[PDB]
Design a protein around this ligand. Sequence first.
Ligand SMILES: COc1ncc(-c2nc3c(n2C(C)C)[C@H](c2ccc(Cl)cc2C)N(c2cc(Cl)ccc2C)C3=O)c(OC)n1
Ligand SMILES: [Cl-]
Length: 94
Amino acid sequence: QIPASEQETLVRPKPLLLKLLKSVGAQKDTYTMKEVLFYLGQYIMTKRLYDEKQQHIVYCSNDLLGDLFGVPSFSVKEHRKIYTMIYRNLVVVN
Ligand SMILES: COc1ncc(-c2nc3c(n2C(C)C)[C@H](c2ccc(Cl)cc2C)N(c2cc(Cl)ccc2C)C3=O)c(OC)n1
Ligand SMILES: [Cl-]
């Protein structure tokens, strides 16, 4: 699905994404995609937003994550879709 270089992309989160990131990690201006991806992963895991009997599906209809991504649920295996959902919440910097 994804090239390995993608995680090196330098990004500046939009306000809503930054709000979420600050609840799981230190506040800075610029992140790598690897960092954004990790913090979002930890947010999901700590808040237990996944189905216990169906661990590939994240449910976020009752969470700010749902507002960020614009979906009630998604699969952790759908990597291309996740990248698209994240990208709409940031500006790439070069
Ligand atoms: C309960 O057991 C359990 N174990 C494991 C998982 C679990 N599976 C994956 C991820 N997780 C966690 C950290 C949420 C993780 C992931 C999912 C959603 C988001 Cl926004 C962000 C991340 C970082 N990701 C993934 C997604 C992309 Cl685009 C690229 C690379 C990876 C590795 C996965 O494939 C998981 O997901 C809820 N549950
Ligand atoms: Cl929330």
